[PDB]
Design a protein around this ligand. Structure first.
Ligand SMILES: *C[C@@H](C)C(=O)c1ccc(C)cc1
Ligand SMILES: *C[C@@H](C)C(=O)c1ccc(C)cc1
Ligand SMILES: [Cl-]
Lengths: 305, 305
């Protein structure tokens, strides 16, 4: 028992982190096979970040300008190219620690672990979610760019995020590993503001199921509701609309607990309308929404890698 | 910016996790050099857990009864012994992935990362704290015993916890790596209840400093207090007494923010007396107490390993 914000074991990714230096800028890169991926703004000066023409800036760079260091050993760069907002540095040595992996573009509401790194060295690991406004609420400082987010499937690391930018509001924006930003954000220091940070309803419900499994049940009530009635309430509180697809996804948690999905919606409805009244659920005083249904099943079962 | 419950990178520990099978029981072991550490209750049957005489139960076991598997390869056990509540299995091969390490017995209020494992395979990583009642609030299921807690110091893994027991209240108890339980708990299925779960005041204050650093400042007030006045309030709310040693430890965070320690105590005092009024601090609606002062400095600076 017990339920914790849990990240994936980070060892497989630790073995892929390298340092990339272009001029005086030092970011992180991801070394898979004989390619190193990093944010293209490694080539920019702090001044350039206001309106960079990356294509023009790249013309002044050659293979030998990209210094790539795996631990204490330098890697030899034998080619480079730009794909969207990432750079692909071809090196002459395959990473011997490359795990089985894939690149995945995740959907808002999906969760992933982030390995925060600086100068190519891991600093810590935490769990995040792609927010409905396509930001993530991370923990990133100068030089953290190029740190990646990922999920693990027994033996396969699915990379879904690479970190690029911090918005003036302190939230974070980045790309998939093909270099395409999540949401409308760009690798420019400009006026880009995040949209509404709506709450991920299906994740809240999964977490309420997690609570029931782990002993917390004071919020269960004698009521039920319908998808349309609930969604009327979800809208007033800036919650994602709940769909039949979401209901279907919660099926297994409903079976394991014997609480119908729509009964749990009625519990969530009452919590939204009346608050927590100073109580807590799984050690939180708010409704947590960065656990997916699959996360809850995984932690409450013990899936390994 | 941003502040997250952050665990240490787990790769160094992942390389030490093995499976230990005695009879039909399968737990986790920690493989360092040519020794494997695991909970002594690996030798117990479920029936035995009520009143086991481990010394007598061990007499029936020989080296070949302890099956140790690192991944898919079996390790040869050439000796075994009991030290307090752990078993030390001497194997004929040093772990090639052994990191620089130490065994440390931590104090209540200190934090550590836990690598949750099952059948010797890592499942996830999360951050914990030794509670003042010497429990930890973890996430553990059947077979998780032998999972360990640790801190990392650039290159040195300090092991501080090995998991043994879940109490009927759903909290967790375990030992240091010399096999000595934290608190009064025993590896017996019996009536052992946890004491008061008091709040770790110095950690709450560190986290409030973390909030100020990262933009959250609505709770700052125009007041101050004294150690004796504050501690009068800490007692009514089941908070640890704050000492001058705690004040000294918060010195660096006070300098970085320009907020005197006792001024921050007055802010915490008002939050205890009046609550949050429906607001949040660093995304929480309660006062978080599993970040140490050193944790806050580390995350807000970017220390690596
Ligand atoms: C732009 C970089 C990857 C990043 O996320 C950052 C840079 C500088 C500070 C102070 C914070 C975050
Ligand atoms: C005793 C073992 C290590 C443990 O922590 C546990 C065992 C069984 C369940 C259901 C939960 C936790
Ligand atoms: Cl909370």
């Amino acid at each position: 028992s017990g339920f914790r914000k849990m990240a994936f074991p980070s060892g497989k990714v630790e073995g892929c982190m390298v340092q990339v230096t272009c001029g005086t800028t030092t970011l992180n890169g991801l070394w898979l096979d004989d390619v190193v991926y990093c944010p293209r703004h490694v080539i920019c000066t702090s001044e350039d970040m206001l309106n960079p023409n990356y294509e023009d800036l790249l013309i002044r760079k050659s293979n030998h300008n990209f210094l790539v260091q795996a631990g204490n050993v330098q890697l030899r760069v034998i080619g480079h190219s730009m794909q969207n907002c990432v750079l692909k540095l071809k090196v002459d040595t395959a990473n011997p620690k490359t795990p089985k992996y894939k690149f995945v573009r995740i959907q808002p509401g999906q969760t992933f672990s982030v390995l925060a790194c600086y100068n190519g060295s891991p600093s810590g690991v935490y769990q995040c979610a792609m927010r409905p406004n396509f930001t993530i609420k991370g923990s990133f400082l100068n030089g953290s760019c190029g740190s990646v987010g990922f999920n693990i499937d027994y033996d396969c690391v699915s990379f879904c995020y690479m970190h690029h930018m911090e918005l003036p509001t302190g939230v974070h924006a980045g790309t998939d590993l093909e270099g395409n930003f999540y949401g409308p954000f760009v690798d420019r220091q400009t006026a880009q503001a995040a949209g509404t940070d709506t709450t991920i309803t299906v994740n809240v419900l999964a977490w309420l199921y997690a609570a029931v499994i782990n002993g917390d049940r004071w919020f269960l009530n004698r009521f039920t509701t319908t998808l349309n009635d609930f969604n009327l309430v979800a809208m007033k509180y800036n919650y994602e609309p709940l769909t039949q697809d979401h209901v279907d996804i919660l099926g297994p948690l409903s079976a394991q607990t014997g609480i119908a999905v729509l009964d749990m919606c009625a519990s969530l409805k009452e919590l939204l309308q009346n608050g927590m009244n100073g109580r807590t659920i799984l050690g939180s005083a708010l409704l947590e929404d960065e656990f997916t249904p699959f996360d809850v099943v995984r932690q409450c079962s013990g899936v390994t890698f």
